Amino acid sequence: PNYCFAGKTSSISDLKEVPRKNITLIRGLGEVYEGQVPLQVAVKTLPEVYSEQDELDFLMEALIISKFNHQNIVRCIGVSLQSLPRFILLELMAGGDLKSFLRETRPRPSQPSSLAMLDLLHVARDIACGCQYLEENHFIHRDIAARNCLLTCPGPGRVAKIGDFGMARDIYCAMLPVKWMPPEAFMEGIFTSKTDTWSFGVLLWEIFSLGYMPYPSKSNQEVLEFVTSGGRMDPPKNCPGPVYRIMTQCWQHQPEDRPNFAIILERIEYCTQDPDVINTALPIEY
Numbered sequence: 001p002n003y004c005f006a007g008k009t010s011s012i013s014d015l016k017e018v019p020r021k022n023i024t025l026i027r028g029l030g031e032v033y034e035g036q037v038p039l040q041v042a043v044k045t046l047p048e049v050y051s052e053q054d055e056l057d058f059l060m061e062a063l064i065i066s067k068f069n070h071q072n073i074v075r076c077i078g079v080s081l082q083s084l085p086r087f088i089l090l091e092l093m094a095g096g097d098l099k100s101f102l103r104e105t106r107p108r109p110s111q112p113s114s115l116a117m118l119d120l121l122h123v124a125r126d127i128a129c130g131c132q133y134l135e136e137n138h139f140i141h142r143d144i145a146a147r148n149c150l151l152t153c154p155g156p157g158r159v160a161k162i163g164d165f166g167m168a169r170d171i172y173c174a175m176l177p178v179k180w181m182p183p184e185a186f187m188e189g190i191f192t193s194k195t196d197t198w199s200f201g202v203l204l205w206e207i208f209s210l211g212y213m214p215y216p217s218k219s220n221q222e223v224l225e226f227v228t229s230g231g232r233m234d235p236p237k238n239c240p241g242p243v244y245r246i247m248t249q250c251w252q253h254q255p256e257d258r259p260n261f262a263i264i265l266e267r268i269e270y271c272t273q274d275p276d277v278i279n280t281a282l283p284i285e286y
Contacts, residue, residue: 001056003172005067006137012059015066016078018089023080034092041077044088055086061169062088072130074150074163095151095158098123102146102211105154108285117240118278119156120207123149125268126160131200132261134162135193142191143167144199145180146206178220179213183228184255194255200264201250202233208243209236210282240277242270 003010018037025043026034035043046058059081066076077089095101105114127149134141141162150163167177171191182198184190202214215223215233232251235244246267252258259267271277 001060001063003060003063003067005064005139008067010063010067012063012081015059015062015081017082018078018080018087020080020083020087023087023089029096035087035089037077037089039077040092042090042092044090046086046088048085057166057169058086058088060172061165064165064169064172065090068133070130070133072126072159072161073133074161090163091161093150093152093161093163095153097147097163098149098151098160099146099206099211101151101154102207106210106285107282112284115210115282116278117280117282118272119158120282121243121268121272121278123151123158123160124204124207125265125272127162127203128200128261128265128268130162131196132265135196135261138193139168140191140193141165141168141196141199142171143177143180144196144203145177146203146211149203174220176220179215179223182251182255182258183253186224186228192255193260194258197250197255197258197260197264200261201247204243204247204250205233205236208239210285212236237283238280240271240274240280242267242274242277246271 001012022037023043024036026036029042031045033043033045035041046055062076062079065074074093075091077091079089080087107114131141131144143164143166148162148164150161152159152161178186180199180202182195185195205214206212215226218226230253232248246264249259250264
């Protein structure tokens with residue numbers, strides 16, 4: 001079971017084994033636990049009842065994450081494979097997943113100053129930086145989506161990071177994330193760096209809608225036919241035009257017409273600079 005990244009080949013033997021004795025589970029978060037090794041960690045467990053194939057997949061995602069080195073990709077602290085159940089130790093992300101965060105932290109009468117446009121643009125920039133790192137190292141994520149991004153904390157200093165690599169791990173139907181996929185992925189099973197660009201546009205829509213499911217009211221098959229025919233999502237409520245434009249550029253039908261992440265980053269930067277953009281009020285959910 002070998003994995004190749006950035007020029008180097010690796011095996012599970014390369015994974016940093018942490019003695020099971022040094023690991024204490026604190027509480028459940030989702031299975032995933034808050035743990036201590038005193039370094040605080042997230043502990044991903046492999047159910048003992050699963051297959052030898054699931055165990056192989058489990059270990060492969062460990063290897064994949066451990067070989068990344070970037071601030072916007074969750075760190076792997078190590079593993080505990082000498083005991084059952086098997087543990088993967090990850091950077092603890094106290095802010096939780098991004099979709100849940102957006103939904104739970106939406107501006108409302110309780111506190112209309114929960115989030116502002118700049119907060120959303122910073123999350124977008126954070127994930128775009130992670131995606132650019134994957135792009136420049138020729139890694140295709142295949143499932144860029146709010147559910148797979150994590151926050152270091154709920155508060156204003158939060159940093160967003162790509163936290164799940166299960167789809168890339170498998171690749172290395174009713175469950176396929178069709179709503180995040182470009183046509184050539186849909187129809188031909190073709191994946192490139194521009195695959196992730198399309199998904200990032202959908203992620204941007206998720207962010208600026210404050211956590212709505214993409215293509216609201218549409219089923220997967222309806223979305224497939226919609227997108228193939230040239231259909232695209234409308235802007236999220238109150239979304240500034242410059243931000244919607246990034247989305248529509250990401251969703252160009254031809255992959256060669258979609259921006260790479262370096263371009264996406266510079267466009268996100270330009271948005272953060274425009275006072276008209278960042279002074280735009282987010283909708284208050286009543």
